[PDB]
Amino acid sequence: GRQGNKFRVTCGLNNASTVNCADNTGAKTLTIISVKGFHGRLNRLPRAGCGDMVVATCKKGKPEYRKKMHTAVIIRQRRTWRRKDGVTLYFEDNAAVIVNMKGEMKGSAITGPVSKESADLWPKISSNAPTIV
Amino acid sequence: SHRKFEAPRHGSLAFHPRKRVHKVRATVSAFPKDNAAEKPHLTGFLGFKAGMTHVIREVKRTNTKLPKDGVLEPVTIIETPPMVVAGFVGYKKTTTGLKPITAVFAEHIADEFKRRYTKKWYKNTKNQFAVHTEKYNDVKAKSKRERQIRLIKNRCDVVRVIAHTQMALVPLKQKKAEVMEIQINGGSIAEKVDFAVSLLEKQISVNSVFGTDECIDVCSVTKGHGYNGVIKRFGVRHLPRKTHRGLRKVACVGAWHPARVSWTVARAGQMGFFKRTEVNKKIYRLGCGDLKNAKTEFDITEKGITPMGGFPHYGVVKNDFLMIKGTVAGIRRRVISLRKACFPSTTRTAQEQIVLKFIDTSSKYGHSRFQTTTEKKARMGPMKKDLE
Amino acid sequence: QVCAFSGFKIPVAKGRKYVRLDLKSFTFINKKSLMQFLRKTNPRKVFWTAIYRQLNK
Amino acid sequence: XRXXXXXXXXXXXX
RNA sequence: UAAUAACCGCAACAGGUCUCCAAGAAGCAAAAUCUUUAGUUAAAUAGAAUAACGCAGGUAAGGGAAGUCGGCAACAUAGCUCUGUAAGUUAGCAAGAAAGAGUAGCUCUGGUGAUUAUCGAAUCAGAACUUUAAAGGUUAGGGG
């Protein structure tokens, strides 16, 4: 359920990287396990950037979300990445929102700014985003 | 036994052996395939790298999601003062390759060309081309020259002009010229020699050789690094911290029983001064005539291509220049052999029109803020100096 | 663009943007200013800033 | 089975 | 002489060998660091260049054990004052549990005595103001 392509966004989120959950679905933090579309290499850890759909497990949250594996989208990251128009940009924290394969967000609201790359790729996130930075 | 896990080999076997070159100038291995159904023209040039800046260019491709305000890209500035054509040579196709038949030179030759033929000029008698010039107008020598022209027209297939640079126009301390043979691709051998004769003693500027938004091939010698280990040379994996005798090496240099170390293994050695050819490089600004400045249709302030404080380790560019998108092989002051593309690129990005929106001229040292020193003075205002 | 701490006019293709969780985004001209911003240093007490020079004289 | 160790240090008394 | 050259180790060997006298700073401290009296500047040779691979000491964006037999190595906590401190228990402990706050400079205020107004001790508490907001140069617990 992903629309269009994405430019190069340097991936600052690894395997076992912990991110916040900006949704309101009782899940606090998710730790990245794998990244959808990742092309494997020897000894390389999976990498995720803004707008990258990941597979993550919830280690902190309500019982219906903890100790389970969900699917998320990185909406902001602390890694500095460069836009194609010579704009260097980075956020304050790494966060994600739970989506399914078809792309519809599980939650109903997002707290904090949402990067443009995650907003363009997923139309459902941009509809519920406060601001698109 | 088989290796447990598979991975691509480190380093290319197409660039083996890694032998450092002897001359700074790099000779092109070929010229674009000749077509006999067009006017004669030169298929190459030669310039000196100045430095690197960045430009904001307006995207002209369609069906692309690039920003509409412009894309930040790097450029390389290659100062290319005019060349002096000082002869020409015809090549014949034999069963062992092209064989130079004769070389015909002009009457007047500059000391920059004569410096190539010695190794201690200040102790030489500097009598190069003396007999060729003194007896240029004699009846016997004129007949000989007329035979060289007719011999080439009869028994030759390739004609090249021996053009050399003028190093009094560049900030380099070297005085001897840089000779390069530029093949003439065009009409029949009859009209190729006619064009080559017309160029004798004349000057060729880069605007005549290259067009606008043209993709070219660049051949140059890379930046030297010296003796380097396997980690830098090839990119092997560093060994664990626990390792005895060192970390930055290849653990296994071959199996027991080919009984010899293979040429395919990574060994420490020279990295650096190699000759590399890069193809399909677009021209952004043809710095000839009006476009010798750095202003654009959107940014109209009057400024030259040299950043504030001069190009680092190079100086000030005040002659014709090229604006090549991206990087070329070699550091500043290197000699770059340009060339028309052997395989012309047909991609939509190769045919795209280049519209520069901003050309950077801020100082290439530190975190600069001002484009021109006049607008540095305006913003800062009068200081303690020049006020008292 | 103008720098968030120093107040200098930011040259094109030079600088880093910082986005906070309170929907506030700032752009800085170099790492020298950005670290000053993160240490909660007032540009009014930093002599070389454009903010300081505009307040005094 | 197959073991591996060796060391000696006398080296005469010259 | 009594030892980084006079003793024992093949030697002018980074190993070993019992004692006496013992200044200032700072500090709880004979600690670390600097110095005065005394001793020495030589103690298995140097000069130039500043490649790889090393031995010793370091730092590093984003992520944080995914590396590995295994947090091996390194990082991190670290002084003092005040508050606060669990399960378990042989009722003595655990316990510096865990956890949180304060700390600088300058100008002041007050408490703790002796001799019968004069004289004296470092110690504790408190208040304005200032700044680059304070144990951290050195020494200096990771916890459950």
Place this chain on the structure above:
RNA sequence: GUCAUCUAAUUAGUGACGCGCAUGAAUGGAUCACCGUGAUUCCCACUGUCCCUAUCUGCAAUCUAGUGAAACCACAGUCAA
């Protein structure tokens, strides 16, 4: 081994079951409070262990003047079958 629990994932750890190849009572059985440069597992924090390598310093290595060994050595030293 079977059931729970720890993890996304547990030949690991812990709590239980016990026809236990071949446990068991001063060859001591069961029990752990304090203690341990003892063996094992899990959390928090921190980090070049790692993604994935970059870079700085000293001493060497390099070259030179002086000085100057040892192990080893049938003869020696390019490959395929």
Place this chain on the structure above:
RNA sequence: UGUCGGCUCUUCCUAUCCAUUUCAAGCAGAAUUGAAAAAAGGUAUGAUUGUUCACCAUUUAAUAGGGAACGUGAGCUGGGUUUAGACCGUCGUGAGACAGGUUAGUUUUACCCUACCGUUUCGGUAGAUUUUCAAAGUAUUUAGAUAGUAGCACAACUCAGUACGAGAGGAACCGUUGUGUCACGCCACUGGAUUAUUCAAUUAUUUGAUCAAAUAGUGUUGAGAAUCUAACACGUGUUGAAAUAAUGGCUGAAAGCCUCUCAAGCCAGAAUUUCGUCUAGAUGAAUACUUUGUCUUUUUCUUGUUACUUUAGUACAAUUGAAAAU
């Protein structure tokens, strides 16, 4: 002859997992299954175990099977095994045994030859005589027998909710645009190191105090140019012709018909081969100047080379050697 595994690294096999090209199906579409050409390119991340093996959780176009002294210890590790300490269980009267379990246990030497990777020094290729010529020396411009060889893969838009199908479902060729990796580079912009002990601040000690420093082997902290560098920044490898393999065909006999040929003759067809292109490179060629014009050997000067100097000896213009194809 250092005995398991893992780590690092290269190469080789095909009995092929993916990508490319084909044939077949009980192949309507999609997903599949059997088979041929083809080994040039890829084939991953983790929990448990010393494990090879195995089993789970993901991801991917695929996460194929193997060899090289069961590849690889003067390459690493020392987890297991496999000495010497100690414990439990069974066995033995006892010392002691245990493919029974547990715990702690020194990993030495390359400066030799070769190989491989880079890097120097000396040597040098035989048959032309139109003085507008020939040869030697120095220097530049070039030349290319040979050796290596590099780009791959995926995704999005449109094709298209179209072909196909009752429905459910559900493609592809061209074209466009991006991403990942590999290779070569490079320093503009972003980031990192920083003994320019740069600039500033500051703890302890010492200069009587201020200034200015020094010491704590770089005291420490903040910013920090240059240079180097990014898996952290960014460029190029979208590139052209011919001939092919499996296979599909054309004409066409053999064999009056049929047949793609275990016949002659052709066409189309691959991540294929060869040109083209990139890298290293042997014998070489052209030009500039210095010369020499029948010739050499041995001495000898030079850092070295050529020309050169001396004593001699040798030859002296004039009949040689071409059809092509079949």
Place this chain on the structure above:
RNA sequence: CUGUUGCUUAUAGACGAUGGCAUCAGAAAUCGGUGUUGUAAGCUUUAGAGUUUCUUAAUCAAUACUCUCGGGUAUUGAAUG
């Protein structure tokens, strides 16, 4: 001709090699451009929480104001003259 040698030479570099100039050579200052840090030392400089001695003027005082966009550094592998 070529090599040594010099520029404590570079676009190069372990050593050789390689590349450039060699009297219109070279090197060094100063000097302008260009960068880094953050406003130098002085004073009869105006703010200063407070204190002391005179008798109400001195003096002491972390910091802070003007001179001061100051001072210092800047090829060492930066660019001019």
